[PDB]
Design a protein around this nucleic acid. Structure first.
Ligand SMILES: [K+]
Ligand SMILES: [K+]
Ligand SMILES: [K+]
Ligand SMILES: [K+]
Ligand SMILES: [K+]
Ligand SMILES: [K+]
Ligand SMILES: [Mg+2]
Ligand SMILES: [Mg+2]
Ligand SMILES: [Mg+2]
Ligand SMILES: [Mg+2]
Ligand SMILES: [Mg+2]
Ligand SMILES: [Mg+2]
Ligand SMILES: [Mg+2]
Ligand SMILES: [Mg+2]
Ligand SMILES: [Mg+2]
Ligand SMILES: [Mg+2]
Ligand SMILES: [Mg+2]
Ligand SMILES: [Mg+2]
Ligand SMILES: [Mg+2]
Ligand SMILES: [Mg+2]
Ligand SMILES: [Mg+2]
Ligand SMILES: [Mg+2]
Ligand SMILES: [Mg+2]
Ligand SMILES: [Mg+2]
Ligand SMILES: [Mg+2]
Ligand SMILES: [Mg+2]
Ligand SMILES: [Mg+2]
Ligand SMILES: [Mg+2]
Ligand SMILES: [Mg+2]
Ligand SMILES: [Mg+2]
Ligand SMILES: [Mg+2]
Ligand SMILES: [Mg+2]
Ligand SMILES: [Mg+2]
Ligand SMILES: [Mg+2]
Ligand SMILES: [Mg+2]
Ligand SMILES: [Mg+2]
Ligand SMILES: [Mg+2]
Ligand SMILES: [Mg+2]
Ligand SMILES: [Mg+2]
Ligand SMILES: [Mg+2]
Lengths: 119, 73, 88, 101
RNA sequence: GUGGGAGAGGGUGGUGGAAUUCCCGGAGUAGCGGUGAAAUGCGCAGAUACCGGGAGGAACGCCGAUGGCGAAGGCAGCCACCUGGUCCACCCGUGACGCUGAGGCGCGAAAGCGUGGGGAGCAAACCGGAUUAGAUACCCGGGUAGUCCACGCCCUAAACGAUGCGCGCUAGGUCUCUGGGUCUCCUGGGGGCCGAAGCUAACGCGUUAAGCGCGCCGCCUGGGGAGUACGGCCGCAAGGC
């Protein structure tokens, strides 16, 4: 209880899970969901379907606060990242606008061995 | 294929060395605050090279962006 | 660096005659200027090895001339040296 | 002696009184080092492409002074001392390289 | 000499924004993370995800190019100072002053050594989780030296074009970087490709020769034993020649 009816819907996709955080017009989180918050536990969290449920769960949890419209912020290139958008669109919540804001360094820290090579 | 118009042809005489003309410099950045390629800027290697330098100056001054958020998607 | 004025002074101060720009003396003179300007530079920036390469190349170009000058007119030689204050 | 361009960004919240003092302190040091203001362009303020010092705007100055190189760096560093001075960008003046003309 | 030019060539100081980590505040709640699948691990002392602030170290996205500079190693944010090389035009000066270069001397990626400093991220060793017939490995969670700075050592390498330096001579086509011009195009320097003659065992090379020639240096002489042993010289050591 706090009533907002307009805020941010941050999607955090990765090759291992998707996770949505909904906030107020100032960035403070109201509710969130993820592949784990829903039943999935292993690699199923990174599933595009997982993303869907996770997104929808958060939409509902936010609807409960009077949330009606929200701006979307995409981050990462995980699977089921578009499915997370898609969901938020059909989640009753009005999707005011999508914006990909994934961070990318201008080259700073040496990546883990798993992430090395370029060009 | 880098179609559409060229950022240069679509402009008049300008000082590729003036790091303060935020209006014309701005024209060479992408939707993101990224510096466009020769394929798009329609500049010469020598010119493009001078741009990069000036643009970088305007960014440090505060006159130009280092990176912007991608709208729509 | 070294301005036209500086450059010009030494040139004149050494030309064997009016208009003499490329005589063995003029060169040796001019070269000495660089070497000295560069030598001072290296005392400060000791890690600027790259520039040092130039140095060796000048010092060696100078040797070539003086070595020549001395073989042709051992006088203008002892002269050019004395003025510039070189040798050992 | 070489021609340089002394760019300076100031606090966008200085009152006519404050602005004036800071702005003169600038003139001051310029002398104390060897500047010879050839022309100014107090463009005032504009909307920064990103927040500098937490502000979305900045008060931009400018001068096309001439001075003794050996000081340039030494001078600029001085200008930065002030708290309302958030940017000091000096550049060896150049011949405008035209283009698409 | 004079007048012009391009450049991540070198040294010094200063400085900018993105990101990671950490700490502070807010908001918020049950997981996060990771994989083929997992577990270790981290989280109700409240993590992950989100917003604001602060600190710090290291590296410089787009520009970026088959691009440029350097003798090689190698060199990329921006600004200033200090400094090397080099190219073009004018035909002005000297008047063969040239080329090469045993020994010497200087430089010389990485790792490594000494002393002091720094330490975000990464990560030999090492500590764990998996995997497997085993798994002193690959994958996963951690993590020390080190990776960074100053100063001094070390002197190696697939230090490669696996192609020593200079000079003259012998079709072109084409793209490109950088000068000069009466600016299709001409002329000079550099970077690519294909290819005349020619060369080459073949592959290929071919005005950036591996062609035709001259000068000088270095090197080779079947494989293994062996880059070993001995001697010497060098190095704090590792070890180098
Ligand atoms: K032009
Ligand atoms: K658990
Ligand atoms: K130079
Ligand atoms: K140690
Ligand atoms: K053939
Ligand atoms: K021995
Ligand atoms: Mg000249
Ligand atoms: Mg450089
Ligand atoms: Mg917190
Ligand atoms: Mg709390
Ligand atoms: Mg536990
Ligand atoms: Mg509790
Ligand atoms: Mg975190
Ligand atoms: Mg710290
Ligand atoms: Mg080369
Ligand atoms: Mg190389
Ligand atoms: Mg003549
Ligand atoms: Mg004569
Ligand atoms: Mg030699
Ligand atoms: Mg070394
Ligand atoms: Mg090292
Ligand atoms: Mg050490
Ligand atoms: Mg130490
Ligand atoms: Mg690690
Ligand atoms: Mg086992
Ligand atoms: Mg590991
Ligand atoms: Mg060192
Ligand atoms: Mg190679
Ligand atoms: Mg060709
Ligand atoms: Mg050519
Ligand atoms: Mg050419
Ligand atoms: Mg090349
Ligand atoms: Mg060929
Ligand atoms: Mg043939
Ligand atoms: Mg030849
Ligand atoms: Mg041998
Ligand atoms: Mg044998
Ligand atoms: Mg035998
Ligand atoms: Mg043998
Ligand atoms: Mg050995």
């Amino acid at each position: 209880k706090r009533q907002v009816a307009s805020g941010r819907a941050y999607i955090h996709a990765s090759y291992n899970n998707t996770i949505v955080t909904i906030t107020d017009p100032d960035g403070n989180p109201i509710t969130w969901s993820s592949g784990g918050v829903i039943g999935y536990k292993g690699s199923r969290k990174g599933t595009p379907y997982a993303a869907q449920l996770a997104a929808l769960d958060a939409a509902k949890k936010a609807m409960a606060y009077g949330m009606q419209s929200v701006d979307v912020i995409v981050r990462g290139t995980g699977a089921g990242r578009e499915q997370a958008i898609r969901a938020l669109q059909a989640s009753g919540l009005q999707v005011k606008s999508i914006v990909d804001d994934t961070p990318v360094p201008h080259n700073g820290c040496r990546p883990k061995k798993k992430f090395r090579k370029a060009s | 294929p880098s179609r559409k118009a060229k950022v240069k042809a679509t402009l008049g005489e300008f000082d590729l060395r003036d790091y303060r003309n935020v209006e014309v410099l701005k024209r060479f950045l992408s939707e993101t605050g990224k510096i466009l390629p020769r394929r798009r800027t329609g500049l010469s290697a020598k010119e493009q090279r001078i741009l990069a330098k000036t643009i970088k100056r305007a960014r440090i001054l505060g006159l130009l962006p280092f990176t912007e958020k991608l709208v729509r998607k | 660096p070294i301005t036209k004025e500086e450059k010009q002074k030494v040139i004149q101060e050494f030309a064997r005659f009016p208009g003499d720009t490329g005589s063995t003396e003029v060169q040796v003179a001019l070269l000495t200027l660089r070497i000295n300007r560069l030598s001072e530079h290296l005392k400060v920036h000791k890690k600027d090895h790259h520039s040092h390469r130039g140095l060796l190349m000048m010092v060696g170009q100078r040797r070539r001339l003086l070595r020549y000058l001395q073989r042709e007119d051992p006088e203008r030689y002892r002269a050019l040296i004395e003025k510039l204050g070189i040798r050992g | 002696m070489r021609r340089y361009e002394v760019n300076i960004v100031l606090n966008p919240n200085l009152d006519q009184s404050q602005l004036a003092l800071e702005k003169e302190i600038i003139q001051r040091a310029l002398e104390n080092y060897g500047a010879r203001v050839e022309k100014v362009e107090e463009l005032g303020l504009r909307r920064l492409a990103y927040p500098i010092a937490k502000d979305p705007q900045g008060y931009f100055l400018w001068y096309q002074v001439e001075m003794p190189e050996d000081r340039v760096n030494d001078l600029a560093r001085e200008l930065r001392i002030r708290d309302n001075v958030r940017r000091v960008m000096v550049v060896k003046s150049q011949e405008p390289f035209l283009a698409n003309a």
